[PDB]
Design a protein around this motif. Structure first.
Motif, short mmCIF file in Angstrom:
data_model
loop_
_atom_site.label_atom_id
_atom_site.label_comp_id
_atom_site.label_asym_id
_atom_site.label_seq_id
_atom_site.Cartn_x
_atom_site.Cartn_y
_atom_site.Cartn_z
N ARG B 61 -55.14 17.65 78.18
CA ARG B 61 -55.27 16.55 77.26
C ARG B 61 -55.94 15.35 77.90
O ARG B 61 -56.30 14.41 77.18
CB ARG B 61 -53.91 16.23 76.72
CG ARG B 61 -52.96 15.64 77.72
CD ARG B 61 -51.68 15.15 77.02
NE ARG B 61 -50.92 16.24 76.43
CZ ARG B 61 -50.06 17.02 77.09
NH1 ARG B 61 -49.87 16.88 78.39
NH2 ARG B 61 -49.44 17.98 76.44
N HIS F 130 -60.88 18.08 64.37
CA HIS F 130 -59.81 17.48 65.15
C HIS F 130 -58.44 18.06 64.77
O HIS F 130 -57.57 18.19 65.63
CB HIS F 130 -59.83 15.93 65.03
CG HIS F 130 -59.41 15.39 63.69
ND1 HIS F 130 -58.11 15.04 63.40
CD2 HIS F 130 -60.14 15.07 62.59
CE1 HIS F 130 -58.05 14.57 62.17
NE2 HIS F 130 -59.26 14.58 61.66
N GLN F 131 -58.27 18.49 63.53
CA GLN F 131 -56.97 18.95 63.05
C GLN F 131 -56.54 20.24 63.71
O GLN F 131 -55.39 20.37 64.15
CB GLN F 131 -57.03 19.12 61.53
CG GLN F 131 -55.80 19.76 60.87
CD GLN F 131 -54.51 19.04 61.05
OE1 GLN F 131 -53.57 19.56 61.64
NE2 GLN F 131 -54.43 17.85 60.51
N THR F 134 -55.18 19.16 67.12
CA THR F 134 -53.83 18.62 67.10
C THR F 134 -52.81 19.73 66.90
O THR F 134 -51.71 19.67 67.45
CB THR F 134 -53.70 17.53 66.04
OG1 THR F 134 -54.64 16.48 66.31
CG2 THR F 134 -52.30 16.91 66.00
N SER F 137 -52.35 21.74 70.15
CA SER F 137 -51.44 21.27 71.17
C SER F 137 -50.04 21.79 70.93
O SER F 137 -49.32 22.14 71.87
CB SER F 137 -51.39 19.73 71.22
OG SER F 137 -50.73 19.18 70.09
N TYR F 155 -58.61 18.21 74.98
CA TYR F 155 -57.93 19.46 74.65
C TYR F 155 -58.85 20.66 74.66
O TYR F 155 -58.38 21.79 74.48
CB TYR F 155 -57.27 19.40 73.27
CG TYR F 155 -56.15 18.39 73.14
CD1 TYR F 155 -54.96 18.57 73.79
CD2 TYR F 155 -56.29 17.25 72.36
CE1 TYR F 155 -53.94 17.66 73.67
CE2 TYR F 155 -55.28 16.34 72.24
CZ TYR F 155 -54.11 16.56 72.89
OH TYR F 155 -53.10 15.65 72.76
#
Ligand SMILES: [Mg+2]
Ligand SMILES: [Mg+2]
Ligand SMILES: [Mg+2]
Ligand SMILES: [Mg+2]
Ligand SMILES: [Mg+2]
Ligand SMILES: [Mg+2]
Ligand SMILES: [Mg+2]
Ligand SMILES: [Mg+2]
Ligand SMILES: [Mg+2]
Ligand SMILES: [Mg+2]
Ligand SMILES: [Mg+2]
Ligand SMILES: [Mg+2]
Ligand SMILES: [Mg+2]
Ligand SMILES: [Mg+2]
Ligand SMILES: [Mg+2]
Ligand SMILES: [Mg+2]
Ligand SMILES: [Mg+2]
Ligand SMILES: [Zn+2]
Lengths: 25, 83, 101, 221, 132, 217, 129
Positions: B61, F130-131, F134, F137, F155
RNA sequence: AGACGGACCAGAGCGAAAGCAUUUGCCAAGAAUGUUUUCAUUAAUCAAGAACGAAAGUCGGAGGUUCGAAGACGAUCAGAUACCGUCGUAGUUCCGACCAUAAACGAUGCCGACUGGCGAUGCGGCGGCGUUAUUCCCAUGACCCGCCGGGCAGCUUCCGGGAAACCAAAGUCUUUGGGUUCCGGGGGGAGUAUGGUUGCAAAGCUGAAACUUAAAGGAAUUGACGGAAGGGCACCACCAGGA
RNA sequence: UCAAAGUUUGAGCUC
């Protein structure tokens, strides 16, 4: 009484206390 | 972990990122297992063996992981030293 | 709580500026806080020039202009309705809109 | 009654192959299904309702009271869980809290104080943890001292099976939720603490998806 | 105001989406279709369903709709993608190349190429977007 | 991939790269994407070294082969540019596509209908997707992604440097990936060229669509 | 003015190790620092650093590994009797099993356990674990 | 005749800080930059002590254009000894004497180190196709593309912190110590009293107690209200009208 | 391109 009068009123008060003590002296 | 008698006491020895040397936790859901196919050098077909590289979530990250990997490959002769 | 980062003004390196008298009021506002508007405008705007253009002698003779620079005070601005209130989030959007209006 | 599972993890567990949830924690896999844990440890597991706390937000119609349950669960070796649920009525609120805790159960790392002979009893080192305001430092204690702590920390660390441990506290313990979240982070970072023990390089065993890729695909789509 | 409810609309999208062919534009006929195939208890429900089903059939007959995956559209995509021209646009007799890619290939192994042209430098430095 | 002239790039392919303008990056430059840049032009565009693009590609070959069961590859593009590409790739490789509108909470929400649990992902553009990141992660997912000089490396675990802006270089990079996955296993011989054309992977504009239907009629 | 060279250096390394940085340059080279690094190195906590001699206060380049949680300093340099050594090492360390308190002595720069063997009290410098 | 030097005027500069903008001349200074300039530890922070320190206020002159405390009257208003108006004193200006107080706010003490970007900018310095004036070249000037030092600011992110609001600093904290000053310990009572000291005076500075009292406050959430704005509706709203 | 708009039994609200 807003601090405007607290401070100013204590000034009018201090003048009165000084005179009252002077007559006793 | 063991005492003088020598007994392994902890029930499970955890994984440790290979890139940072940081022990990856029981709830690190950004964690990884990259399995790299091995190649028959002349043939260009899968041998059978893999080449695992484990990464912590944090450096991922932060974003410097792909460079780190490129370094691992080029260090281990996977990527050209000429490059 | 801190309402705005700049305290509705532009005093970051300086320290003091000269005050101005309002036009609608006379309220004293620091020039740097005070609203500044450079309004140049035709002594005759749009409806009038069509009417007044009838009143001109020469066919198409250019009109000079009225070079103002206005400053208003705050309470006058909201009353005169030049600026609207905005949300906490939109507040940081300090870009003015394009040149449609 | 019959848990017919959907997930990949659920079906491998259901076929009775994956022997312990430590094998899953090794790989950091999200334990979404509760029936796995009921499969493994359901017998020795023990619950404690910590408190019933009535929050209420004001409305035009009075205020809507709705209760917020804190639930400690845990077998006395290794594993412990912490469920928190808010709802209008207790049976569903407590059930769903208990499921969420079971989902979240984590292991505790335990070592030896001083002389290494025997079995590990206390905490390894001076671990701390926090949440919001509250800070709670856990300390190593020798055998037989007992848990020197408040009823509450004392009550959990027992459930995890930590017989001897000194404690220190700071802040507004009155926020109970914060006290539990902070002592939970404390006992979580015990397995995240980098001892010289672990200088020894990790042997990377095969992932359960790799071993069983043809099973889940053959069993379902 | 004669506006369609979600029970009206969802029913019309289900009717056109499942049996686009049976349906059509005129209400009173495709009504006979709707009453036969679908058992609507009320006549008002039947007729409303049919009237939104009709106008929607005209929408689709007019053209393709955005937020719906028609099987016919899936077939035309397979058809369109299999559409191939005579030659690829990438195949070119001469390829223009900049002096940096010339210098870099000449330092690399790939020095001489047959169909390359190290083109002129873009004179007149005005690339930045104006400030303010 | 390293020290092996067999899998190395070809004179035709080099001409293909330059024709797309893969070397031709963007105007802005992130400090992390320095390794891939060669040099700056007059007119201020950074030229990407296509051999190292190649090397990253061979790393892709290794990774895709390492995923043994090919179903559990996922391949996403929200924007149309890589929409035909992800389809053609799923067609050839036997993968499971996601074509437009990546419904958020698909990987986390179990009850949600489209709960897919893959083992590897391939995104065409980070900002638009981007979704997925997220979600990527919350779930332990590795990720390949086509990235420009601007692209941010949050990421992302294996970015591939290309002119992801252009149409041709994009479809092309997908065609080469599908090839290399096939060549690296026992399927195709390197003597013949692959029948499929890269313009098969391409994106056609509606005006070109009306132009085709008009030319047909 | 810059008083403690070591005090600046050890912060710089701890702000490297938190970020997992790989090698670190430190600008003022002191003899005490050098002795300190050699103490940790013989015992295996870091790799092989190298020092850049300028006819000046040198520089030093440490190739960092990842086993160091913290490497701290104690200013002012307190005297330490053998009475207080246990209370210091108790209150200053994670545990009774590991972690070290390094104090330079008349005898020389060495760990506290070596001070226990040799029967030698002295001036506390710092610690690490 | 005396104020004032608009517009040019920037999220720009300089000053220890208040602050500093009509032309020209004289006087000296200084931050910053380049430097293979000299000395070689000469330094950092500081009770006591000291220089400066907007406006009002005060004492003398000089000057007295405008505004304008005070004051009067005229207006509205239940009352207004205010908000509105016409006048209008001290003051507002200069020189010379006191004074040392503001939300004197970045409400953020000084030095020193380290850990992310991004574009813009001001100065000095360096390098580099070409345009453009000096015109007839050089070497300068205006553009142009960069690098360097520190500088006023800006944006940016799961760096991490923080009660949060927020901060690349309000970070490098129970893994707690780089150096050093000042200063706070429930609210009120009270910055009062008493004492001391300064000042022409105004007042400044130092600075208690009794007694009373279980709470005082901060950030953020949902309501309710709004003589704040934006949207939308209704003949028990209006509009148009009617009994 | 801004004159104004005050109050409300002591006789019982509430987890
Ligand atoms: Mg003037
Ligand atoms: Mg001021
Ligand atoms: Mg003093
Ligand atoms: Mg004055
Ligand atoms: Mg004065
Ligand atoms: Mg006087
Ligand atoms: Mg007046
Ligand atoms: Mg009167
Ligand atoms: Mg008046
Ligand atoms: Mg003040
Ligand atoms: Mg402290
Ligand atoms: Mg008090
Ligand atoms: Mg009371
Ligand atoms: Mg009524
Ligand atoms: Mg009406
Ligand atoms: Mg009024
Ligand atoms: Mg009453
Ligand atoms: Zn105003």
């Amino acid at each position: 009484m807003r601090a405007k009068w607290r401070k100013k009123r204590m000034r009018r008060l201090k003048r009165k206390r000084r005179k009252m003590r002077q007559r006793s002296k | 972990m063991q005492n003088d008698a020598g007994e392994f006491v902890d029930l499970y020895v955890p994984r440790k990122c290979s890139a940072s040397n940081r022990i990856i936790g029981a709830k690190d859901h950004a964690s990884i297992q990259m399995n790299v196919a091995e190649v028959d050098k002349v043939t260009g077909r899968f041998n059978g063996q893999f080449k695992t590289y484990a990464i912590c979530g944090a450096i991922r990250r932060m974003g410097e992981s792909d460079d780190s990997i490129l370094r691992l490959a080029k260090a281990d002769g996977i990527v050209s030293k000429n490059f | 709580t801190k309402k705005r980062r700049n305290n509705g003004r532009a005093k970051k390196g300086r320290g003091h500026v000269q005050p101005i008298r309002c036009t609608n009021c006379a309220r004293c506002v620091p020039k740097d806080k005070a609203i500044k508007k450079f309004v140049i405008r035709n002594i005759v705007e749009a409806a009038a020039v069509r009417d007044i253009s009838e009143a001109s002698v020469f066919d198409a003779y250019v009109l000079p202009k009225l070079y103002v620079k206005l400053h208003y005070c705050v309470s006058c601005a909201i009353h005169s309705k030049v600026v609207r209130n905005r949300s906490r989030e939109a507040r940081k959007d300090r870009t003015p809109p394009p040149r449609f209006r | 009654k019959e848990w017919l599972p959907v997930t990949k993890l659920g079906r491998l567990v259901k076929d009775m192959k994956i022997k312990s949830l430590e094998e899953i924690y090794l790989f950091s896999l999200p334990i979404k299904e509760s029936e796995i844990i009921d499969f493994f440890l359901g017998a020795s597991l023990k619950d404690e309702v910590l408190k019933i706390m009535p929050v209420q937000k004001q409305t035009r119609a009075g205020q809507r009271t709705r209760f917020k349950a804190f639930v400690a669960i845990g077998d006395y070796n290794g594993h412990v869980g912490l469920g928190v649920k808010c709802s209008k009525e207790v049976a569903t609120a407590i059930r769903g809290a208990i499921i969420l805790a079971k989902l979240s159960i984590v292991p505790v790392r335990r070592g030896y104080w001083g002389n290494k002979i025997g079995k590990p009893h206390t905490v390894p080192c001076k671990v701390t943890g926090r949440c919001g305001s509250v800070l709670v430092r856990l300390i190593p204690a020798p055998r037989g001292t007992g848990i020197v702590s408040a009823p509450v920390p004392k009550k959990l660390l027992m459930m995890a099976g930590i017989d001897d441990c000194y404690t220190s506290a700071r802040g507004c313990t009155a926020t109970l939720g914060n006290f539990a979240k902070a002592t939970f982070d404390a006992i979580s970072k015990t397995y995240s603490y980098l001892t010289p023990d672990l200088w020894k390089e990790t042997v990377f065993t095969k992932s359960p998806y790799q071993e069983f890729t043809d099973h889940l695909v053959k069993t379902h789509t | 105001g004669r506006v369609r409810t979600k029970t009206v609309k969802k029913a019309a999208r289900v009717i056109i989406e499942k049996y686009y062919t049976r349906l059509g534009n005129d209400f009173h006929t495709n009504k006979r279709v709707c009453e036969e195939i679908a058992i609507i208890p009320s006549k008002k429900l039947r007729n409303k369903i049919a009237g939104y089903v009709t106008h929607l059939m005209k929408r689709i007959q007019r053209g393709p709709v955005r937020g719906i995956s028609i099987k016919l559209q899936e077939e035309e995509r397979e058809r369109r993608d299999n559409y191939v021209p005579e030659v690829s646009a990438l195949d070119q007799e001469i390829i223009e190349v900049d002096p940096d890619t010339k210098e870099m290939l000449k330092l690399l192994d790939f020095g001489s190429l047959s169909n390359l042209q190290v083109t002129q430098p873009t004179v007149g430095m005005n690339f930045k977007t104006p400030r303010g | 991939s390293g020290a092996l002239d067999v899998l190395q790039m070809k004179e035709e392919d080099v001409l293909k790269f330059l024709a797309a303008g893969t070397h031709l990056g963007g105007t802005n430059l992130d400090f992390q994407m320095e390794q891939y840049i060669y040099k700056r032009k007059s007119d201020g565009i950074y030229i990407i070294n296509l051999k190292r693009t190649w090397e990253k590609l061979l790393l892709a070959a290794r990774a895709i082969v390492a995923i043994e069961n090919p179903a559990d590859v996922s391949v996403i593009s929200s924007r149309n540019t890589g929409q035909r590409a992800v389809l053609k790739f799923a067609a050839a490789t036997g993968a499971t596509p996601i074509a437009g509108r990546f419904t958020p909470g698909t990987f986390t929400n179990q009850i949600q209908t489209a709960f897919r649990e893959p083992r590897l992902l391939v995104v065409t553009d980070p900002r638009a997707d981007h979704q997925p990141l997220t979600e990527a992660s919350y779930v332990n997912l590795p990720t390949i992604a086509l990235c420009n000089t601007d692209s941010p490396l949050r990421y992302v675990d294996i970015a591939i440097p290309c002119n992801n802006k252009g149409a041709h270089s994009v479809g092309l990079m997908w065609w080469m990936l599908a090839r290399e996955v096939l060549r690296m296993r026992g399927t195709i011989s390197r003597e013949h060229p692959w029948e499929v054309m890269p313009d098969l992977y391409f994106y056609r504009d509606p005006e070109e669509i009306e132009k085709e239907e008009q030319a047909a009629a | 003015v810059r008083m403690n060279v070591l005090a600046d250096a050890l912060k710089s390394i701890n702000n490297a190790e938190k970020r997992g940085k790989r090698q670190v340059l430190i600008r003022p080279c002191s003899k005490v620092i050098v002795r300190f690094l050699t103490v940790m190195m013989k015992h295996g906590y870091i790799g092989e650093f190298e020092i850049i001699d300028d006819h000046r206060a040198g520089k030093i380049v440490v190739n960092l590994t990842g086993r160091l949680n913290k490497c701290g300093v104690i200013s002012p340099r307190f005297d330490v009797q053998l009475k207080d050594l246990e209370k210091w090492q108790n209150n200053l360390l994670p545990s009774r099993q590991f972690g070290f308190i390094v104090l330079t002595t008349s005898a020389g720069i060495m760990d506290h356990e070596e001070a226990r063997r040799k029967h030698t009290g002295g001036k506390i410098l710092g610690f690490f674990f």
